Amino acid sequence: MELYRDPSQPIEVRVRDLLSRMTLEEKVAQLGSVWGYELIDERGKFSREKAKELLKNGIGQITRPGGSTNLEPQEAAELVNEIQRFLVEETRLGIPAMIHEECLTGYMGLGGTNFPQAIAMASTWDPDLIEKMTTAVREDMRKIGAHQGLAPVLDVARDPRWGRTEETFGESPYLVARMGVSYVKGLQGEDIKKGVVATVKHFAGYSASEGGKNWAPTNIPEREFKEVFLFPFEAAVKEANVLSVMNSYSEIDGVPCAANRKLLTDILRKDWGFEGIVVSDYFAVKVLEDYHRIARDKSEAARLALEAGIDVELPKTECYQYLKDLVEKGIISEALIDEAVTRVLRLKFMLGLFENPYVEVEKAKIESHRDIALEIARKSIILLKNDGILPLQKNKKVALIGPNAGEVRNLLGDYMYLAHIRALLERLKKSIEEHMKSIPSVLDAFKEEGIEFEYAKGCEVTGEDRSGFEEAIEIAKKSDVAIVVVGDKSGLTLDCTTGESRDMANLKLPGVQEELVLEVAKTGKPVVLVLITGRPYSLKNVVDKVNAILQVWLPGEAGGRAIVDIIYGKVNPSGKLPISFPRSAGQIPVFHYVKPSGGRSHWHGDYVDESTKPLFPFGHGLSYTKFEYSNLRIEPKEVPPAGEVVIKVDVENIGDRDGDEVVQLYIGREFASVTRPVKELKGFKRVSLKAKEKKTVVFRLHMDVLAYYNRDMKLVVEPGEFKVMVGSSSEDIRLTGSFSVVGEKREVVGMRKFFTEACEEAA
Amino acid sequence: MELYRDPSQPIEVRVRDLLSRMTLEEKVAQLGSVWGYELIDERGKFSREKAKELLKNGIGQITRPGGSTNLEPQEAAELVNEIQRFLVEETRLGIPAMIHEECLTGYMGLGGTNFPQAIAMASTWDPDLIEKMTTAVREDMRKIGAHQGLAPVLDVARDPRWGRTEETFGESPYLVARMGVSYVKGLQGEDIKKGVVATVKHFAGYSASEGGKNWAPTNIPEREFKEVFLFPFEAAVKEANVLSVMNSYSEIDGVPCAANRKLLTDILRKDWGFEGIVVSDYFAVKVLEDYHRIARDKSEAARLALEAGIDVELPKTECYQYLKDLVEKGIISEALIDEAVTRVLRLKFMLGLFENPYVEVEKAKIESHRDIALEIARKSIILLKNDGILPLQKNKKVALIGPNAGEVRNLLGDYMYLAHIRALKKSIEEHMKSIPSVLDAFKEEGIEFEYAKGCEVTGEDRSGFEEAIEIAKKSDVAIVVVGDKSGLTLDCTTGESRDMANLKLPGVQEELVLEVAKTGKPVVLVLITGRPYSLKNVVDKVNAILQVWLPGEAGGRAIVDIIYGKVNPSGKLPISFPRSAGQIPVFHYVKPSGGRSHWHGDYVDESTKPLFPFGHGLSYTKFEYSNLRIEPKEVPPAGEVVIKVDVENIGDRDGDEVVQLYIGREFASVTRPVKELKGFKRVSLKAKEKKTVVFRLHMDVLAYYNRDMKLVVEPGEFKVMVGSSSEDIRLTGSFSVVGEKREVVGMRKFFTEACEEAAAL
Ligand SMILES: CO[C@@H]1OC[C@@H](O)[C@H](O)[C@H]1O
């Protein structure tokens, strides 16, 4: 047999052999893609007639065979097996396809669990739980023949106007990086032939667009770029061995990321050693012409993207077909095509596809992971305020009010299939409506818990109709407590208030929801405000008028149960904010790791009309119990520039309810050669404490973790003092101390540690 | 006599000779300063006792001998002459001082005219008038013995939250650069011995702080930095030969500007060839320690600032005295001190100070320039909206309402002396009294009106609303005059240190407007403010809106002249007005992906378009544009195109139009602005008059930075858009650059030349 077909040969040998056998047309085909829906008949069965035209010379990827066809898992598996058999048996060289799907909050197709949104995952501060989640998603994906998931999003978000805030892990490069590495490790596992390629996106800067506007310029200078935006991707590449990266739609300072070789090749491949594939964001190659106006036709767009380092044009071949013409016309060298093809073929061999590209359809039934979803939902909800009203007693009569108390659709995030696919909106409309039925409501959770309540919708999520207010106020007046549940509808269409393409300039709760809360509060009845939202909203006008506030980031299918569990104290809330909540849009940005001159206006401190401090800081989240921190140890007190310090604190649950605390480590530095954050998150640990239990939390902090870029753009650790601040939020610091680095400034070269190790031991 | 004393020797010879004669202590003293107020007794007279301690080894500069002492001009001149006599006659080498003052809106001291703020100067679009203004300031300053004025501000402002917006020339690097060069040329003149050193500030980026917050980081990437922020300074250095630069208090991406040699030396001196002095912003050296926490003590702060390229520590020696210790301890080389001292001494020789450092006290009386101030005020006011109510008839009974109608203090900007000094009580109060009020101008114009204050600028007291509503109901038209109080203290709403997050009119002024409008009477809203405010909630509720950037002493007359049509408004916005703070930033020169959210265009809750765009400004007449010519249609990469348009005043009132040229480019190797201002001309047209406006656009003017950070002109097509604002484009065409991509090296043209000529009969 040909060497490439022989599994006893090393993958490099099989790649070289296969590349040597391919025509230019076959090479270019491996750099493109076809939609799943382009390969089916009207009953969702594989169409050989359509394949003969689209797959005749092979293909790089199939885009969303499940997510784009509305097929159930076993039908999707059957379609993928038929695609693979056509490629294996009816093309000259028999190269199988790689299949991708969206999977941010679980496989995005019919039959897959809807996990809480990414911003909720981050709010758990529980990286191991997120690894458990993506290990389950891995199995769901492999069952249907999918090899690559387009997640996680490692964009660092400090601008809550942006509609994709909900898909991020928030404002902190450290927390984003740490959640990202766990996410990747769960999806990929150790041997990718048994796992799913993760795709970190959107490389890089995409969350910092001008004015918070989707695709607008992301104009970020170099040190901030390296330390804030690139850092999580760097960790994913070097520590988690991530196998795919997708580029950003935006320009950085005049250069679209899809046309930037300095970014997609020089940083990602040359400096960091990435060995996987770069896939385009959808249509990102074509819109170098149509949107950014830097390519005069599809062939120039193709050339810019290939030279930049995009290996696969998604979601369908459009410009990359012209790479054949560019070679034949002597505009680009076939060697450059070979380099991209080599990367794609290597990964296909690594995924085991030339040994076995099929799946057992009989096993393609995806299992529910409601259990994991509920654990994430229960740990992600944040208690922002509580004057003591929560937890509620079960004998109190409740007035349950607001659009998000009644409508299950609004629990869903923008990459949860039954929200996402609405962007296409009769057969599909009916299928969505049917599937929606199976997801539990907030109403259902209250009824299941046996609470006596009346429900009034109050108002819609959008619009200005206040005609439902009277009914809501009337039920409030006759109740013991009003629970007002307000917030977003997430997705990609005009009727949505958050999600990709739905950016919110002024951060007011949508519609007349704010006025609804305030009218209810005017009754004088105690008010629990529950925000079911995808972004921070300005709560300046309601915070002081309500008794408690729960932030529930778009929780997906487990949301109702977790909310009711928390309200009644069956679960003690333990989520912590992974992004600052501004007092108002005009305060943007607010974030915890400002420099000494950031987060204030000099010399009066505040704006004329507003504090410079967020309403709720990074790391904030209350509990139904109290935690007492004591006995800070920092050893040794002097370390050399590649040494390690060990920081320990004792934490005791001194209250009356069991509860988890997220202990946070912040590090500050002054008198470096550049300015540094007054405090920045550099470690954390979720610790479970029974009432009256005490434990020790231990952080092992290598100096590599503290490295920063100097005046000459070198990554350094300089001698001097580092401040250690340990506490329950970035403001609620409980114990502070310091240690010194002693010795000559160190340039940190090659591989280095990214993370503090965090453990618990007996006190 | 020693060579340095000999005026027949070349300045370089005198500098070298003097430097060779100085001790280290004398050298370091030339790099420092002392406040004017530190050298006076209780009677405002020079104190020899105080001088013996502070001036014994000479001094670089005296800070604000007029502005910090509350002396009248002739007393300030006498003080400065006595300081100079002490230096010349009682120090070993007899080196005189350079004196600086603030002068953005005129010499900032008793006796000086209060001109309209910088943002109003820009709204004139009349660079020659600004040159005329600073030529007058030059004379005022030289009369009192001042040699350097700390102006103009060339910070480009796209964030109206920032309290120093009023001190800028707005959002456009082109307009800011063009106004800046005229400003500098007027102050300095050709031979600086007869002029005043201009000080471009705050180098660079200071107007783009995080969140619009004063001194917060200005994190700007390189192409944007070079094209938007550095460009006006580059033009001032290379075209206007500016002789001083002041640094920014902010960091750029981890590096404070006062400690950044790459900025204050490598760009400014090495790349651009600047030969003057860099002066620190006030205390900017000291706060490398106290604020930015990158210097461990004052001697490290001194070393960082000297290595970066600051020549003079202002406003008083504090860290730079330790340069002596740093040399004596072998930490820095004396050669580095010598380099800075050379720059200071050169400029002192060029200013003529070793030949004559004194002024004639009998001539130190500063003349009023109310005439120039009134021309600027009349050309700077912008008519943002007019449903036809304006101009008003003089027979209509007016209800004049609002805090800014009655309070003269609120006409003043943050660097106007009688506002600034609020950060002697009888002297201030007396001088305030001499400035005409908006009330006074209505009375002088003979209008019948009643006045109701309505509310304060700040706070939430609505108890004055009833009286205002009552006078509105009894009038024909309500003229509601609202806006800022500008300055540096907590009671101020705009000005340095007074940043406004949410862009609502201060206090309950917006509610005042809306309550008055509920009467159903016509409303003319007059904004006397230092920054764009969100007008989303009032625009559709009022009949006309005038923006009056803080106009200084000529404000009342100009406003009333415009309201009644004695002057036809002709100002144009130099900065976009956002619909709301959440839309920030909005600016006219966005890339194809800027100024919109893809793919629905708008935000969920807000348009992505500003409420009023850059270049906007209405008139009481109509201008008709015709006959676009662009020649030649193909030009090589260092060629020139000539663009002509005819503009005719087709209405019934004489008026000025500001014709604007925008250039767009696509299919460059980097993304480019869909449109950006590249030329303009204020043209006067009598009713039924037609003229041709001519723009001569060298391709150098269109250069931009490519992927490799080279300044280039690339072949391709450029779109030409000529019109009455950045949105009100009246004629469009294009021309092509043909030939090989060009790297633009060395000196190049910065500006389009703009002229008028006769239109065809
Ligand atoms: C159209 O939007 C793109 O579609 C594919 C997703 O993976 C990317 O996140 C998103 O930007």
Ligand SMILES: CO[C@@H]1OC[C@@H](O)[C@H](O)[C@H]1O
């Ligand atoms: C204290 O503020 C400084 O004082 C001196 C002025 O020239 C500068 O503009 C200003 O930033």
